[PDB]
Design a binder for this molecule. Structure first.
Ligand SMILES: [Mn+2]
Ligand SMILES: [Mn+2]
Ligand SMILES: [Mn+2]
Ligand SMILES: [Mn+2]
Lengths: 48, 48
C-alpha cells in the first residue's frame, strides 16, 4: 500500500504538470513530466 | 503561484519517498528520489 500511495501522488502530480503545459510551453516542465512518467512506470512494475 | 504549487507537491512527495527509504532500501525508490531533488532545484531556480 505505501507504493500505491506513492503512485497515487505521482498520478495527481502529472495532472498538475499537464495543466500548466496546457498554457505555458516551458520545456523544463515537459522534462520533469518525462521523469514523472518513468516514476509511474517503475511503480506499476514493482506493484505487479 | 502555479509553480509554487508544483514545488509544494514535490516537497510533500519527497517526504513520502524518504520515509519509505527509512524502511525498505529499494534502489528504485532512491532513483526516483534523486530525480525529485532535481525537480525541486529546477522549480526553485525558475521561481528565482
Ligand atoms: Mn488549477
Ligand atoms: Mn515523481
Ligand atoms: Mn506514513
Ligand atoms: Mn517530481
Amino acid at each position: 500500500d505505501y507504493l500505491r500511495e506513492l503512485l497515487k501522488l505521482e498520478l495527481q502530480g502529472i495532472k498538475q504538470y499537464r495543466e500548466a503545459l496546457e498554457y505555458v510551453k516551458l520545456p523544463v516542465l515537459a522534462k520533469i513530466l518525462e521523469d514523472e512518467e518513468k516514476h509511474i512506470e517503475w511503480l506499476e512494475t514493482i506493484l505487479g
